[PDB]
Amino acid sequence: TRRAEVAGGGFAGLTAAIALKQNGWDVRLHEKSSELRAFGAGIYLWHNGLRVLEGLGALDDVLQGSHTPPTYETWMHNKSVSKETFNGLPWRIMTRSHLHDALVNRARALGVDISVNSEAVAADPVGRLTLQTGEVLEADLIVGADGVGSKVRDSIGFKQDRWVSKDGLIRLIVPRMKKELGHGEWDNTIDMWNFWPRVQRILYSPCNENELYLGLMAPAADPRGSSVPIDLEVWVEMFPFLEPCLIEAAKLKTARYDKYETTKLDSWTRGKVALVGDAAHAMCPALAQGAGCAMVNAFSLSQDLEEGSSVEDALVAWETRIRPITDRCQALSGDYAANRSLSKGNMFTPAALEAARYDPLRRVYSWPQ
Amino acid sequence: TRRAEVAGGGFAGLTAAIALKQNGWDVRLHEKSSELRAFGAGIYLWHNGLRVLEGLGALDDVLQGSHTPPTYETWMHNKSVSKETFNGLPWRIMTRSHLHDALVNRARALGVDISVNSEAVAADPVGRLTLQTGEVLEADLIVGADGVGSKVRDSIGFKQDRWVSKDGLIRLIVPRMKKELGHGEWDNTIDMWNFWPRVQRILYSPCNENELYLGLMAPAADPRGSSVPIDLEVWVEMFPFLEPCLIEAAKLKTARYDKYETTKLDSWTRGKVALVGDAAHAMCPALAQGAGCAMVNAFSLSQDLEEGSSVEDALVAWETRIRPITDRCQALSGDYAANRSLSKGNMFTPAALEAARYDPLRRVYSWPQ
Amino acid sequence: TRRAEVAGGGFAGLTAAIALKQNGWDVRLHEKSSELRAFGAGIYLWHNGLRVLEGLGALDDVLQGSHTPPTYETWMHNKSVSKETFNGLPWRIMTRSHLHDALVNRARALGVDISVNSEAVAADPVGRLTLQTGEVLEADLIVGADGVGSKVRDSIGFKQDRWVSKDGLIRLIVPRMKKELGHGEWDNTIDMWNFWPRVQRILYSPCNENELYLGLMAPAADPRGSSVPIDLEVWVEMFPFLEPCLIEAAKLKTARYDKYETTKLDSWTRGKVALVGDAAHAMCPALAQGAGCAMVNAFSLSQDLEEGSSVEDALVAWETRIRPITDRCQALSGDYAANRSLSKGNMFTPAALEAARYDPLRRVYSWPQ
Amino acid sequence: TRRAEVAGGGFAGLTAAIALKQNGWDVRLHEKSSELRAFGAGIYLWHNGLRVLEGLGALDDVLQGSHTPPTYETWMHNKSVSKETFNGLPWRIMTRSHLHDALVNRARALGVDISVNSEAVAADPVGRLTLQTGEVLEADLIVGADGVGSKVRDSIGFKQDRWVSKDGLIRLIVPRMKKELGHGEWDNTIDMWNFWPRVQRILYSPCNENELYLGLMAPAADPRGSSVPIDLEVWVEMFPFLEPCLIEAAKLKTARYDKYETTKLDSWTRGKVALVGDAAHAMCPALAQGAGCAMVNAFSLSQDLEEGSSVEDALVAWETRIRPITDRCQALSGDYAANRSLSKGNMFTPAALEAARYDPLRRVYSWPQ
Ligand SMILES: Cc1cc2nc3c(=O)[nH]c(=O)nc-3n(C[C@H](O)[C@H](O)[C@H](O)COP(=O)(O)OP(=O)(O)OC[C@H]3O[C@@H](n4cnc5c(N)ncnc54)[C@H](O)[C@@H]3O)c2cc1C
Ligand SMILES: Cc1cc2nc3c(=O)[nH]c(=O)nc-3n(C[C@H](O)[C@H](O)[C@H](O)COP(=O)(O)OP(=O)(O)OC[C@H]3O[C@@H](n4cnc5c(N)ncnc54)[C@H](O)[C@@H]3O)c2cc1C
Ligand SMILES: Cc1cc2nc3c(=O)[nH]c(=O)nc-3n(C[C@H](O)[C@H](O)[C@H](O)COP(=O)(O)OP(=O)(O)OC[C@H]3O[C@@H](n4cnc5c(N)ncnc54)[C@H](O)[C@@H]3O)c2cc1C
Ligand SMILES: Cc1cc2nc3c(=O)[nH]c(=O)nc-3n(C[C@H](O)[C@H](O)[C@H](O)COP(=O)(O)OP(=O)(O)OC[C@H]3O[C@@H](n4cnc5c(N)ncnc54)[C@H](O)[C@@H]3O)c2cc1C
Ligand SMILES: O=C(O)c1cncc(O)c1
Ligand SMILES: O=C(O)c1cncc(O)c1
Ligand SMILES: O=C(O)c1cncc(O)c1
Ligand SMILES: O=C(O)c1cncc(O)c1
Ligand code: NA
Ligand code: NA
Ligand code: NA
Ligand code: NA
Ligand code: NA
Ligand code: NA
Ligand code: NA
Ligand code: NA
């Protein structure tokens, strides 16, 4: 039996572990943290990620208790500038914990061996993974799914450009308060942009009938807008229609102003080691596809390992096949972020939706625009 | 090699033929008409039917050149009473020819032997199909996909209740005239109900950027509203906002006032003969699921024939497994039609969407409400 | 000093009494009822009536505590069909008591001698008024302002057509409940028409920040819709958006289903007797001008009595000058009522607004359309 | 017969001349310009100014061919922030020429002696007016209605503060293009504010079915926004919904970027000389009351001259009676302009509307808020 050692229990690592286990690999997954958890409050998935979930046998648990808004709406200075439904392209909003739980439960159901407090500190291309405990594990495949600060990557040495932004946002889950919001379209995604009187934006993202995912975005140089716990007054001033939800947001002492971070590498493979997710390709969140691409790439890795080739050759074939979708999406999302393109509305163009349109199960693009 | 003879080249027969051919059956399909064509102007499919298309390898050709509205909207007396998006449940509108062409092209690509001017006039449960030419074909499976007036069914004799309504509607494809319609949400499905000043209704159904599917519904006792070609004045009077499209509709000399028709049988099988689609279960169109159920049932038949059982036993197992979804949907659609339930809006309830939610590929219900 | 005896303490009689007293007449007014009061809940005035109030020195007290809606809106089956603002033509809504009080207070301020429990039972063209007490009062002018059942008129004998309708309405004052009505344009006049599922209409008429005037109109043959106190269920069913106000309306045990009533006479004068208001020209309320015309005619009477002619000649001149405006408005309002013309919206045409446009102070038409 | 000499043929001078002529004064009016004309494209009047017009016998000609919008609407960054109708307070929009013509025609009808190319260069408090021709005219009253640069004022010497702003606006009349504007509320006043992406504002003011009054406001430091003829691109960019009207505006080679200008004086009188209008009290246009106050003050002057006092005493009484309304309105309009208060919407408060609410005919405040 082929053995895989996966470093990291995020969406990339769990996807890799499930996909490999379904194909008969002996899979062990190692999470550095003391518990299995997902940070970031909420998350969007699209057709591509939902198809991965179908491929993993985890779609049912995800769709139950998650939300597809009637439309993706954009506001500029409180004026609705677009409503987009992507010509039926499937999409979904959920809490991070909801997605995480579904993947963990599926991995456990399949008998994936999951270890917590288990940090990969070094990886060897010949197929050896060293944990912080000093345990050296031999494997036929090593998956570096260990995030932007991947030690699987950096122990080997990959030529790279990394960037941590000065700016960021505050992501929270609060109650919907739907009745208290009164008249409106409060099941929508609403991306609420402003440049005047200050640069403040809220991405309003319903997760289900109970939970609302809010992203509060202000520059780091704004001492009030970037404050945690949230400066209620400055958010209510520019988003008064969300006051009921913002009052609940202001109670959260766990709120963090998290910075954006990107990674791009010359390659994603070395011998029997494959880098997946933020370890390889962390990107700007404009197109809401960092985890989508991570999951597609992890699932696609399992596919290329079923061709009867050596692991080394399968990994090379995998990157060649799948990386361009991620490269283009990363580049375009970065362009969108820098140009504030989403502020215009109607920017989920055919090109913007390329990654979302990809079906990893059939390996074709679907849901034409 | 197992041989199947399929009577009828509608959506049920083509689905059966493709699904069987994909599983290695030697399939021949017989269409009574001189050409392969689909009547009825336009058609809605939902998740269940779209999943059948995925199973048939015909989804790509269908999604290209078809439309998912941003919302399914209902009007009563020109007042919007509901907007429904079904919590992300996939759905699609297309011309009948668009769906038909996709299925025919797929059947031809797989090497299904299609005959036109080939009418099944008698079927024997032992596996003999007699054509109007006098040709007697022996087969391991006979599929009666030959519509509400099925001769495969009636030559054998199935206890049945059939009903042809006095009332009906006029279904047409016209240009979108989107610019000429001016301000509005003209990519929506809009079910435009009226009881005052007369009983007149238009189901407004965009198929793509070029083609609009209209259903003009008035009682048979209304000599103007039921007239073909359409009485332009009486339609413009109550739907003045559609005048540009109605002017184009009035040019169509091919317009027909078609009656609603239902069939229900005590059983769908006899020996090696299976009845699929309108031959077995024609229903009211309120839930837009007659072809959806027909396609699910045809696809499901192919599945039950892969269990290693006798054809006779597989057919019995098939009906037992799949019929209840169709029975409930038929009953509920008839209830909706009789009570004019759709006129209230917000009537695509979890129960109404049961058939749509069924995934025939995984044999589970998806897209929870 | 010239002496006038006025029969009736309604809007016509009070207007006549004030206007005459301002011109130096010794005026006595006789009200049959035990108290000075105005029935009918609320009332609309337009430019013509507001100009009379200006002429009477009673405009200030009327405008304080009354309401001009931002627009006059019409709904058919809950769909807004028109919004009308009459090109700036002044108009106003108020409670009947508000208008009544303003006129009574002005009459008292001028020293008009007002008697209650004082019914005119006979009038003589030579200038004698007999009260129910048997008191015979001699005067230079007798004003029959004693309503649709005028005894001043009928004691003399005027050729006439009177009509009392079988149908009618329930008029009430309730609290605004503005906050409880939620999203909307609840300061508007909204004429809420329906023919389906039943013939039920509400004229929604805000009087000020505290008081709402509702007219609930259903046919007499409808036992539920015409019931008093109101059948809450049947009104909430068709006007659910007014439920907070309708709950308050249902508490009113004083509610009446009052019938429409009209009067038309061959003449309005006989010797020293002049008939004013409903005594002469009761009309359908479609154009909201019965009191408007009554007040214009009463004020105009005082004007014609300042020409230095005999009272008999002044009265003849008065009717000749002013009656055609009332005749046309009565006729058009009756046409509108019979044809349900207001149900279409946009029916306050230049012709419909003729009476409203008349300025009695300058004797010209203003506020062109 | 009392003789009045009026310097200036603007709204103040024409009002003074008509009002005095109606009271039996021998009135001569002197306009410096070669023709009688009014600059500034369009103008708003309110109840106070409309009542002056009624007092002048010029209301009929003004209301015919002018417009009361259904509402006064305010936008910030294309989002509607308020709709105001002032609780029925009368108001009106018209072209400057429309108002001017009505006043000139009334003055001519009354036999006011109007001279063009007749400039007042000096005034003496004893009642002598010297024209640029050298003609010295003796009079019982001299009216300085000669604008912000009044030579009647400055020849005498009045302690004053004058201010000419660096900023200004471009005022134009263009066709309505109502059909070309498509869906909207295009009969409204719409004050269209923006601070982002640049400081640009359009006051949209329909005058009648044919003519639209536009005020295009940008800072003088903006070389494109302040350009004449208008820089079409920069106006269409921020007001694309007005493109049809802006294309017509760009054709006007007569367009001017006119600066705001204010005047405030310690007194308005000296002996037999009275200063009226912009000569005395030019103000910021935020409350749209510069001409309103000018007309009220000119009309009020005629009233105080009917008390049987000396002209000198009547003038002192006039200023004491009427100036505080103008002082408060000037101050508040300046505050509004400086604070950009109108950008918030809902700022026509009872205090803001004080001047508008004043009725000069009855000398009371009407139309309570
Ligand atoms: C503001 C924001 C919004 C976003 N929104 C979206 C969205 O809507 N949709 C979407 O698809 N994506 C979104 N993304 C992207 C998404 O968050 C990431 O791309 C995705 O979570 C990365 O998954 P991962 O498994 O690669 O890495 P991670 O989620 O970082 O998981 C790595 C795991 O490995 C563990 N670990 C780290 N080092 C080691 C080690 N040495 N050994 C063992 N374990 C280790 C960590 O503790 C962690 O649990 C967003 C990102 C940001 C910043
Ligand atoms: C007004 C209306 C609207 C509808 N809207 C929808 C909708 O939106 N969505 C949806 O899913 N469904 C809809 N339906 C239902 C749908 O039209 C039918 O259920 C579906 O087309 C039936 O397919 P079928 O293949 O069973 O039969 P058919 O479409 O009738 O095809 C039978 C074929 O067999 C041929 N034939 C007949 N007899 C013989 C014979 N003896 N031998 C050989 N060939 C023969 C015929 O010529 C025909 O081509 C609607 C129905 C109506 C009436
Ligand atoms: C449903 C409805 C809605 C209406 N809405 C409007 C509206 O919005 N605007 C509008 O302008 N008009 C409206 N009208 C018309 C308006 O109500 C009448 O035209 C107006 O009140 C008539 O005034 P009046 O003074 O002529 O008669 P009344 O109001 O009838 O007053 C007559 C008075 O004389 C007294 N009286 C009677 N007989 C004698 C006697 N013999 N001696 C002494 N006193 C006597 C009575 O007690 C009464 O107080 C409406 C009418 C109806 C039915
Ligand atoms: C941008 C803007 C918008 C405005 N909008 C409004 C509004 O909506 N509503 C409103 O009410 N007001 C408005 N105003 C104010 C209004 O324009 C003025 O207050 C009003 O026109 C002043 O009238 P006037 O007669 O005092 O002076 P002017 O209109 O300046 O008239 C003076 C006349 O006297 C002549 N003249 C000058 N010197 C002499 C002399 N020595 N001898 C003889 N004749 C002379 C001039 O040629 C001129 O014809 C606005 C002002 C501005 C700047
Ligand atoms: O920062 C964004 O533009 C962004 C856009 N979409 C989803 C998300 O989480 C973030
Ligand atoms: O007749 C209907 O109610 C109907 C409802 N949905 C689709 C359709 O084709 C018909
Ligand atoms: O019955 C009417 O149509 C009517 C219309 N306007 C005011 C009113 O009181 C009644
Ligand atoms: O500049 C203004 O704020 C202004 C406001 N109202 C009318 C007008 O002409 C100008
Ligand atoms: Na991507
Ligand atoms: Na991306
Ligand atoms: Na069905
Ligand atoms: Na059905
Ligand atoms: Na009338
Ligand atoms: Na009338
Ligand atoms: Na003023
Ligand atoms: Na002012």
**Partner chains of B (3+ C-beta pairs under 8 Å):** A, C, D
Q: Is C44 within 8 Å of C288 (Cβ atoms)?
A: yes
Query: Which residues, in sequence order, are bridge partners of residue C190?
Result: C73, C204
Do B5 and B76 lie in one domain? The reply is no
Name the neighbours of A, counting chains with at least 3 Cβ pairs within 8 A. Answer: B, C, D
Q: How far apart are CA B219 and CA B260, in angstroms?
A: 12
Residues forming beta bridges with residue D191, ordered by sequence position: D74, D203
* Cα-based angle A194, A199, A202 (whole degrees, multiple of 5): 55
**Which residue ranges have their beta carbon within 6 Å of ligand 2?**
B 7-13, 30-33, 40, 43-45, 119-120, 145-147, 151, 169, 260, 277-278, 285, 288-292, 294
The region, left, alpha or beta by phi > 0 then psi within -120 to 50, assigned to residue A87 is: left
Do the beta carbons of residue C190 and residue C78 sit within 8 Å?
A: no
DSSP string, A145-184: ---TT-HHHHHH---EEEEEEEEEEEEEEEE--HHHH-SS
Cβ-Cβ contacts under 8 Å, D78 against chain A: 77, 79
Instruction: Among A217, A235, A260, give the residue marking a domain's end.
Output: A260
Same domain, C267 and C151: yes
- Among chain A residues, the shortest Cα distance to C180 is held by A182
C229 lines ligand 3 (CB under 6 A): no
Tokens of D349: 């408060």
Is residue B172 located within the same domain as residue B161? no
Cβ atoms of D159 and D266 closer than 8 Å: yes
Degrees to nearest 5, angle at CA D176 with D172 and D179: 150
Ligand 3: nearest atom to the Cα of C277: 26
d(CA B103, CA B31): 14
Distance (Å, rounded) from C-alpha D79 to C-alpha A80?
Answer: 8
CA A311 to chain centre: 27
What does the alpha-carbon distance between residue C101 and residue C117 come to, in Å, rounded to a whole number? 18
Rounded to an integer, what is the distance from CA D104 to the centroid of its chain? Answer: 16
Considering the domain architecture, whether residues D299 and D175 belong to the same structural domain is answered as no
Residues from chain B contacting residue C79 (CB–CB below 8 Å): 77-79
B61's enclosing H/E stretch is: helix B59-63
Question: Are B329 and B354 spatial neighbours (Cβ–Cβ below 8 Å)?
Answer: yes
Last residue of a domain, one of D208, D239, D260: D260
Strands D3-7 and D141-144: parallel
| Ligand with an atom nearest the CA of residue A342 | 5
Picking from C60, C63, C71, the nearest residue to D70 by CB comes out as C71
Chain D residue with CA closest to B183: the answer is: D183
Looking at the structure of chain A, the number of domains it has is 2
Distance (Å, whole) CA C261 – CA C285 = 10
Measured in angstroms, how far is the CA atom of residue B14 from the centroid of ligand 15?
81
C-beta separation of D299 from D168 below 8 A:
no
Strand (E) or helix (H) holding A273: strand A273-275
Q: Does ligand 6 have an atom closer than 6 angstroms to the CB of B168?
A: no
B interface mutation test: which of A71, A82, A87 has the most B CBs within 10 A? A87
State how far residue B184 is from chain C, nearest Cα, in angstroms.
15
Query: Strands, E, within chain B: which ranges?
Result: 3-7, 26-30, 42-46, 72-76, 79-84, 91-95, 113-115, 120-124, 128-131, 136-138, 141-144, 160-175, 189-193, 201-206, 211-218, 257-265, 269-270, 273-275, 358-359, 364-365
Q: How far apart are CA A21 and CA B275, in angstroms?
A: 42
Angle at C67 (CA atoms; ends C62, C71), nearest 5 degrees: 140
**Cβ-defined contact of B196 to C79 (cutoff 8 Å):** no
Tell me, using a 6 A CB cutoff, whether residue C120 lines ligand 3: yes
Q: Does D134 touch chain B (CB under 8 A)?
A: no
**Distance from residue A275's CA to the centre of ligand 1 (Å):** 13
CA distance C65 to C59: 11
Q: Of C260, C287, C316, which one is at a domain's C-terminal end?
A: C260
Give the residue ranges of DSSP H helices in chain A: 11-22, 47-56, 59-63, 96-110, 151-156, 178-181, 232-238, 243-250, 278-281, 290-304, 311-339, 354-357
C250 and C265 housed in the same domain: no
Are A152 and A184 in a shared domain? no
B195/B340 Cα distance (integer angstroms): 11
Q: In chain A, what residues touch C183 (CB-CB under 8 Å)?
A: 182-183
In whole angstroms, give the CA distance from residue D198 to residue D211: 28
Q: Which residues contact B302 (CB under 8 A, 6 or more apart)?
A: B16, B19, B20, B22, B23
| Residue A224 structure tokens | 């009030």
Gap positions in chain B, given as the residue before each gap (C–N > 2.5 A)? none
Does any ligand 6 atom lie closer than 6 A to the CB of residue B215?
Answer: yes
CA separation for the pair C275, C292 (Å, rounded):
15
A3 and A23 share a domain? Answer: yes
Check: CB of residue B320 under 8 Å from CB of residue B342: no
Quick one: three-class SS letters along chain D?
CCEEEEECCCHHHHHHHHHHHHCCCEEEEECCCCCCCCCCCEEEEEHHHHHHHHHHCCHHHHHCCCECCCCEEEEECCEEEEEECHHHCCEEEEEHHHHHHHHHHHHHHHCCEEECCCCEEEEECCCEEEECCCCEEECCEEEECCCCCCHHHHHHCCCEEEEEEEEEEEEEEEECCHHHHCCCCCCCEEEEECCCCCCCEEEEEECCCCEEEEEEEECCCCCCCCCCCCCHHHHHHHCHHHHHHHHHHHCCCCCCEEEEEEEEECCCEECCEEECCHHHHCCCHHHCCHHHHHHHHHHHHHHHCCCCCCHHHHHHHHHHHHHHHHHHHHHHHHHHHHHCHHHHCCCCCCCCCHHHHEECCCCEECCCC
A285 with A337, same domain: the answer is yes
Q: For the domain that residue D303 is a member of, what is the CATH number? A: 3.50.50.60
Residues of B in Cβ contact (< 8 Å) with D183? 182-183
For the record, the structure tokens of B319 come out as 């009906």
Residue C142: how many CA atoms within 13 Å on its side-chain side?
A: 31
Is residue D99 lining ligand 4, measured as CB closer than 6 Å? Answer: no
Cβ neighbours of residue D54 closer than 8 Å, sequence gap 6 or more: D361
Chain A contact set for D76 (CB, 8 A):
77
Residue A66 · residue A347 · CB < 8 Å: no
Determine which of A73, A75, A79, A237 to mutate to test the interface with D (most D C-beta atoms within 10 Å): A79
CATH number at residue D50: 3.30.9.10
Residues of A in contact with C182 (CB under 8 A): 182-183
A182 touches chain C (CB under 8 A): yes
CA neighbor of C181 nearest in space, from C214, C225, C218: C214
Closest atom of ligand 7 to CA, residue C342: 3
The preferred substitution site among A5, A43, A104, A172 for testing ligand 1, maximizing ligand atoms within 8 Å of CB, is: A43
Resolution (A): 1.5
- Determine the residue of B95, B99, B191, B216 to mutate for testing ligand 6's pocket, defined as the one with the most ligand atoms within 8 A of the Cβ atom: B191
Pocket test for ligand 3, best of C31, C39, C143, C153 (most atoms within 8 A of CB): C31
Q: How far is the CA of A284 from the centre of ligand 9 (A)?
A: 10
* One domain for residues A231 and A348: no
Contacts of B195 in chain C (CB under 8 A): 196-197
Reading the block at residue B350, the tokens are 């979890």
Range of the domain at D55: 39-95+166-260
User: Which chain A residue is nearest to residue D80, measuring alpha carbons?
Assistant: A79
Q: Tell whether B244 and B276 lie within a shared domain.
A: no
Residues 6+ positions from D348 with CB-CB distance below 8 Å: D72, D84, D86
D241 strand-pairing partners: none
* Rounded Cα distance, A131 and B69, in Å: 52
Q: What is the 3-state secondary structure (H, E, C) of D318-343?
A: HHHHHHHHHHHHHHHHHHHHHHCHHH
Q: Tell me if D168 CB under 6 Å of ligand 8.
A: no
- Are A303 and A341 part of one and the same domain? yes
Q: For the purposes of burial, counting CB atoms within 10 Å of the CB of C76, is it exposed (0-12), middle (13-18) or buried (19 or more)? A: buried
Do D144 and D170 lie in a common domain? no
- Whole-angstrom CA distances from A226 to A249, A257, C207, D134 are 14, 6, 49, 73
Question: Are C186 and C151 spatial neighbours (Cβ–Cβ below 8 Å)?
Answer: no
Q: Which of B282, B293, B327 is nearest to B163 (CA)?
A: B282
Note whether B9 and B106 are within 8 A (CB): no
CB atoms within 10 A of CB C222: 15
